[PDB]
């Protein structure tokens, strides 16, 4: 009676209490103090209220399961519809509205039609923080902001991940490739699954480009989910000396203006020899030139370095595969890899000429 | 023998997790036949369903649920061998995997890719089935490649999985002695509960229709996002019965349920004993 | 150590020392594990920081004794056991990529 009254939701709650016989106010409703005084002058109404480990865990969970059964043994449309509903092995029809045309048009019964129920978390989007790994049999290394198709829960979706490292647990700063044989972190805009769920990732899902190699590229688990990530990409500012004394030097071009040097005063720099230093004051007439002080006398063949950190953003890109809405259901094509784009529009790969290593030979070091 | 007793009694202990699979009417166990294109599969699904239900099921399609025990019934479906997408989906929802291996050619990257996708998404039971044992006159090389396939399979599944050997096809399908004791291997498998499956309500769809309105299609003209009924058995946790439950149909997108009418069991198991040929059903 | 057995199976609680700023420090490669036989929580090593990302949580670990052959330098004496398997797969084989960890 009372449950039907509670969940019959076209009648007022005081009408439920009336035909059975507001929460900003925290403390509940009491009588008048005089009525309560004459009511509780007596006391006798409430005087009777006053006065192995593995098998143990399995026993606790089977105790909960028998509690589940013996409390399910109740009203038939209560159990079998609304208090739990359709346990397992129930044969159901399930109707979806606004299913696309292409499914019904191109429905080929070879390809299975699987459906899975999303949790409250898995309908949310945002940055998923994983730790992943180039799969040991995938040949080529992976690159940040190259798409790969993830299989994260029920969904398969192509995303743009960016591989990070917490370099001795200080930053979470941005790599440019995945490592060769171990795990890195990663962050991709996608549907937020729960933490500790595993996933695969694939470069190429089609069959025209299926090649001869191994097709699954990345493996990993999900570490954390969030709405925002704060990851950084190191930028150094390089400048050269042009007037050197003992223990101090005038540094030429890492800044364009004395306002910029004023913005950066007191910062610690270093040469490539590891000589630590500090910038002290902007010089007046040559504009980006400043005066720095070092540990000792630096040389004219050095480069000073201001290690700073620039924030980088994940790219909010997400397309699910929708392979069953195609006329071929293989041959799904998404965003291409960067080498594929360069091969398509014939751009040469970017080569900084002074980034290439050489064979340095030391001259012998003699002093006066 | 006391140290033996301690060190053997230790490896009974495992992580105590919940089960969430019912004991009264469990769903039909999803058996997925996975192979590279050109070996077994069809012939194998046909032979198993012919042995199981006494019914020549020529020209298969879709999931096929049969009753193969007094309480164990199971669903047969076949992945399209070129699609990594369907490979991934049935890796995520299958319970038993019949892993087809062309024993003459050897191992192959499609079955290796399925093995890794399953290993990362919650490795189900896997029974390997090696066909094309028509190597040469050399029974010596038959035995050699037999042992090498067994060892390489044992490095991918637990050490002591079952690799099964099928001989040549005779009259359209496999030898029924071999399929008889293959079904004897399928009948005792003792499934252990997974994690994603046992916190998620999923369902493989064996029947599909659009209950749209054809004169509404005549009005608007075939561009219509049209409604669809999807019939099948559901596994895992109990899917709630209120409309509006969100659902990912794995390959077409995200939807929410509109109405659920549960139906009586089309392939039910009937209530020492043996299984009557009357009660060996097929849906 | 474990009683009458040589190994013991356990449940990974949480990777201790996950905020240690030194790679391959003994504080960092150091896992807390609940043994399943008697329920008690012990602490176990792992071979390195590189194989620290094969255990995550409730992983069904298997752990043996450690066996220090001499007073080490960056040691923390007072952790007795080492992780030798994870989810029924040897993590030295996992570390050299001979097997893949199943879930």
């Amino acid at each position: 009676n009372i449950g039907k009254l509670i969940y019959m939701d076209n009648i007022s709650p005081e009408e439920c209490i009336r035909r059975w016989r507001d929460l900003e106010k925290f403390v509940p409703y009491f009588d008048t103090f005089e009525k309560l005084a004459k009511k509780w002058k007596s006391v006798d109404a409430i005087k009777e209220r006053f006065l192995t480990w593995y098998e143990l865990q399995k026993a606790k969970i089977s105790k909960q399961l028998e509690i589940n059964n013996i409390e399910y043994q109740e009203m038939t449309p209560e159990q079998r519809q609304r208090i739990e509903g359709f346990k397992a092995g129930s044969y159901v029809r399930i109707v979806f509205e606004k299913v696309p045309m292409e499914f019904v048009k191109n429905f080929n019964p070879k390809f299975p039609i699987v459906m899975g129920g999303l949790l409250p978390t898995e309908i949310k989007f945002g940055i998923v923080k994983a730790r992943l790994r180039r799969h040991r049999w995938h040949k080529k290394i992976l690159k940040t902001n190259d798409p790969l198709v993830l299989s994260l829960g029920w969904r398969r979706f192509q995303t743009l991940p960016i591989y990070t490292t917490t370099d001795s647990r200080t930053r979470t700063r941005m790599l440019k490739y995945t490592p060769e044989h171990t795990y890195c972190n990663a962050a991709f805009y996608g549907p937020l699954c729960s933490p500790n769920t595993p996933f695969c990732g694939v470069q190429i899902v089609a069959n025209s480009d299926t090649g001869n190699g191994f097709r699954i590229a990345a493996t990993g688990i999900v570490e954390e989910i969030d709405v925002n990530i704060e990851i950084v990409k190191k930028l150094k500012l390089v400048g050269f000396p042009y007037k050197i004394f003992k223990n101090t030097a005038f540094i030429k071009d890492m800044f364009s203006s004395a306002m910029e040097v004023a913005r950066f005063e007191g910062a610690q720099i270093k040469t490539v020899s590891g000589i630590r230093g500090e910038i002290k004051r902007a010089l007046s007439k040559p504009e980006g030139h400043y005066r720095a002080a070092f540990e000792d006398k630096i040389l004219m063949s050095d480069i000073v370095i201001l290690r700073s950190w620039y924030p980088v953003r994940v790219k909010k890109f997400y397309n699910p595969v929708t392979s069953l809405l195609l006329k071929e259901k293989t041959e799904w094509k998404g965003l291409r890899l960067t080498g594929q784009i360069r091969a398509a529009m014939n751009l040469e790969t970017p080569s900084n000429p002074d980034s290439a290593y050489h064979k340095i030979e030391r001259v012998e070091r003699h002093f006066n | 023998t006391m140290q033996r007793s301690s060190d053997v009694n230790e490896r009974k202990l495992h992580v105590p997790m919940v089960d969430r699979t019912p004991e009264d009417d469990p769903p039909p166990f999803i058996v997925a036949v996975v192979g590279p294109p050109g070996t077994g599969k069809t012939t194998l699904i046909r032979s198993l369903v012919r042995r199981m239900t006494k019914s020549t099921l020529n020209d298969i399609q879709g999931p096929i649920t049969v009753v193969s025990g007094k309480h164990r019934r199971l669903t047969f479906l076949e992945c399209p061998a070129d699609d990594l997408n369907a490979m991934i989906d049935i890796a995520k929802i299958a319970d038993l995997v019949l892993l087809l291996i062309d024993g003459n050619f050897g191992f192959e990257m499609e079955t290796m890719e399925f093995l890794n996708i399953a290993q990362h998404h919650g490795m189900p039971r896997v029974l390997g089935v090696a066909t094309h044992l028509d190597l040469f006159k050399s029974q010596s090389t038959l035995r050699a490649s037999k042992k090498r396939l067994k060892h390489r399979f044992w490095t991918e599944v637990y050490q002591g999985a079952k690799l099964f050997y099928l001989s040549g096809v005779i009259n359209g399908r496999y030898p029924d002695r071999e399929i008889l004791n293959l079904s004897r291997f399928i009948s005792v498998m003792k499934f252990r509960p997974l994690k994603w499956r046992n916190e998620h309500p999923y369902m493989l769809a064996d029947r599909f229709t659009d209950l749209t309105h054809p004169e509404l299609i005549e009005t608007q003209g075939l561009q219509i996002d049209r409604k669809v009924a999807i019939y099948g058995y559901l596994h895992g946790t109990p899917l709630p019965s209120a409309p509006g439950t969100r659902v990912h149909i794995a390959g077409v997108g995200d939807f929410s349920v509109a109405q659920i009418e549960k139906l009586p069991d089309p392939c039910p198991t009937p209530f020492r004993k043996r299984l009557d040929d009357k009660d060996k059903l097929i849906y | 150590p474990f009683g009458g057995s040589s190994h013991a199976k356990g449940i990974v609680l949480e990777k201790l020392g996950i905020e240690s700023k030194q790679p391959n420090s003994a504080i960092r490669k150091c896992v807390r594990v609940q043994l399943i036989k008697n329920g008690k929580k012990v602490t176990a090593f792992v071979p390195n920081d590189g194989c620290l990302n094969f255990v995550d949580e409730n992983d069904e670990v298997l752990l043996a004794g450690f066996g220090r052959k001499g007073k080490a330098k960056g040691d923390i004496p007072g952790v007795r056991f080492k992780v030798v398997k994870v989810s029924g797969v040897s993590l030295l084989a996992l570390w050299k990529e001979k097997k893949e960890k199943p879930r």
Binding site: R136, W137, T210, N212, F214 | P36, P37, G38, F105, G106, F107, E108, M109, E110, M112, R152, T155 | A93, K96, E97, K98
Partner: peptide, 14 residues
């Protein structure tokens, strides 16, 4: 059309 396995997946000398 037979994507044959190769030596590092075959012999598994990781």
């Amino acid at each position: 059309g037979k994507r044959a396995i190769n030596y590092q997946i075959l012999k598994n000398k990781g």
